[PDB]
Amino acid sequence: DLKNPYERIQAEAYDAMSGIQTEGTDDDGGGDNIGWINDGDWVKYERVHFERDASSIEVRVASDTPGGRIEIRTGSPTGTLLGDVQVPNTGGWQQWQTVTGNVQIQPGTYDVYLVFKGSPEYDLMNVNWFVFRA
Ligand code: NA
Ligand code: NA
Ligand code: NA
Numbered sequence: 001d002l003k004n005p006y007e008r009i010q011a012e013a014y015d016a017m018s019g020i021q022t023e024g025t026d027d028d029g030g031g032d033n034i035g036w037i038n039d040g041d042w043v044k045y046e047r048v049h050f051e052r053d054a055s056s057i058e059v060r061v062a063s064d065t066p067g068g069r070i071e072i073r074t075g076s077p078t079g080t081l082l083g084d085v086q087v088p089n090t091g092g093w094q095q096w097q098t099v100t101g102n103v104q105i106q107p108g109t110y111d112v113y114l115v116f117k118g119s120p121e122y123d124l125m126n127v128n129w130f131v132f133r134a
Contacts, residue, residue, distance in 0.1 A: 002049040002109065005132040011114075014043040018077070019116075026094040027060065027128050035093065035126040039068070042077045042115040052134045054105040059085050059114075060128040064093045067125055068118025072103050074110040087125045096128065103132070 003009055012022045012032040019041030025033040034043060057072060067087040073079040083103030090097045118124045 002047045003045055005048050005050055005054060005105075005112070006134065008129040008131045009045055009048070010129045011043065011127040013045070015046040015111075016044040018042050025096075025126075025128055027062075027096040031128070033062070033126045033128045035123070037116045037124045037126070039116065039118050039120045039124065042113050044077075045112045047109055048112045049109045050105055050107050050132070052107060054103050054132040054134055056100050056133045057083060057085060057103050057130055058098055058100045058133065059087070059130040060096060060098050061087045061125050062090050062093055062096050062128075063087060063125040064091070064095075065089060065122040065124060066119065068116060070101075070125075070127075071115040071117055072101075072105075073113045073115055074105075076111075077113050077115055079113065093126055105132070
């Protein structure tokens, strides 16, 4: 029941969340995405085990609005920021692109949170999956 950050983790496979909902995705491979994302919402993935330092994250995203950003934190939604990712308008809620951002994560096992940030006035993005790189 550990999660491997160096292979895709599906965003709907969260252990806790605040503010979001899931739906079926039109992205290739099918499956699901999280959506209805607003400024301050988050998702938690428990027991994510890094055997080696991570230096970036890659996230599969879509947005019909101006987008926003994803903060990577551990331990709690307020835990130290380890990196972030900018998410642009992609031309629609099921128009998918992969974005990346730097992180610094040392080996260990963590509760990983993706915390969504942007304007409070519109929903920000959809997320299919994410994966870290060393
Ligand atoms: Na929301
Ligand atoms: Na960044
Ligand atoms: Na997914």
